[PDB]
What does this fold into?
Amino acid sequence: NITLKGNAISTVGNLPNIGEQLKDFTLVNADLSEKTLADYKGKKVVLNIFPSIDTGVCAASARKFNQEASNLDNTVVVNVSKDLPFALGRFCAAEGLNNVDTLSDFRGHFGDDYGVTLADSPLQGLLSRAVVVADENGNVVYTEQVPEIAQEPNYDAALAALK
Amino acid sequence: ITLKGNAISTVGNLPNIGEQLKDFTLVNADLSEKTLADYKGKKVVLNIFPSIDTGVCAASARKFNQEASNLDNTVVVNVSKDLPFALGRFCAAEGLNNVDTLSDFRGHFGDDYGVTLADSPLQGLLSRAVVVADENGNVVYTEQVPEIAQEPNYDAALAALK
Amino acid sequence: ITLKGNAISTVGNLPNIGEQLKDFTLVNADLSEKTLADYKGKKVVLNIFPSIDTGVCAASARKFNQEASNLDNTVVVNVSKDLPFALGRFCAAEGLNNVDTLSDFRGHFGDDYGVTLADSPLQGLLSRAVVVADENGNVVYTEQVPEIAQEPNYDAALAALK
Amino acid sequence: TLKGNAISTVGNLPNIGEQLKDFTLVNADLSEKTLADYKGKKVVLNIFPSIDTGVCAASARKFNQEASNLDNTVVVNVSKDLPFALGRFCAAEGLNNVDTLSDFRGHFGDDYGVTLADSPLQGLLSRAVVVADENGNVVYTEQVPEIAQEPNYDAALAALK
It folds into this structure.
């Protein structure tokens, strides 16, 4: 059950469960190049799923997690949104950080295949706020569907699953 | 049509002269929605972009919006696949009245108007095109910009409003 | 001063009110050079940017550049580390006279004015700062924007020009 | 030469047989890339006065398509352009295995002896191509005689082969 500012929102589909294998995808980078699930083969992955990364309001917690998670051995943080590739560079949480990709699902099926596209509310069609963590093999270890789209994810619990 | 010299193709065709404008629902930057009904009885210019978040001073586009807005009962509407969160970076509508910049990120404007790109690295974005309609709503003039990078023939479009 | 909230520091210190402006050599968009001599006897506004190539409409700067140039014997000079090849993308000075956009990519204006950033991912770029001087060349008013993202106090800076 | 008149560079380009010197360049997202990021990969150093020209040449587009397709090969564009303008390199349109980096605060241009010493382009990198093998030894270099002219992309490509 997702909500927006208290009011009820729903997502098309369902988020992956712990133990399920990560679903394939094709996302677009800021230079219009494509990234695929194969690009992360054998590496521990954090899917950082946003309604938008073009809001301009970063956060000490949001930045601190992306820095810490990248520091982890053989780990990558992957930001997904419906934002066009022309705005992916505006994600401040990846400023100066390595091992952090910011990718666009503007023409993909990530939101569909992962059950995160929002179904109603003025944010309909955007992704919901969610975090999916997978291991080196690719099976989901931890998930969170943030109950309130405005609130930040439990970055500490997400980090702990990686640890 | 071509993109940076190589040939690109669009899903569909632009509307024909004499045909009525197809309905749509586009989203404003403040997450408000606009519909074809919002422009009933007004001459409409549809300015269709691959992106309005390119970062290039739209000097020619700003000159058109200033002249077109000065015209009686005329509206300029910018349509692109950019999220409503990026519409504010379109400067050509800065300080100009009767000019909307709207998002088709969750609509079917691009398909309904036959402008969505079918191949090339810009696949899924709208192609560069211009549609001018009369007050009744019948399409008067169209332009499918041959080179997606190139700017529209804003002078010919302005003439249709006249 | 802060950069996106975190603390950043600049190599040096801004000039004080009453001091003479230090000389410089900046490059225009067409690869020509401009010097402090180019503004002798004219009231000068130094608008110092980390970048003018960010893609933002800079509504406030356009209102300042329009008003300041309307003033008699006054020039606005935008300085940044952007190469001369990108200066054309600063839209707020488009079509305005007596407003220059210059590059310090091979000078030490940033050093001589104490605005170059020493750390942070923006290290090597200029900080957000404003220096206003009179016709004789002595600084009358300055502003070091505490947060690089925020817009300068264009109203207080303009007052010094008057 | 530049527009017929003679131009000079601060330093000298690396010689064939020499190892690639380290560097620290900036990506468009303000991230840093180093020579270590390309260890064991075939490297083409594509050195520009500016990539903010807005009109990518036919020969240049063909090279990036062919070179990037090559197995264990990377094309690296280095220029003095600020990272905010690196995105204006059109020749890398949609392509993988092509990086565009900035030397606006590094010493790539100095350490590689390509920074221009005079002419209106003073301070910018010269037009040059440096190709090295997987171990890092320079196999091919070119100092483009006219900064406006395009490099001999075929001779560079042959060194990769």
Observations:
- DSSP finds four helices and seven strands in chain D.
- The longest strand of chain D covers residues 73-79.
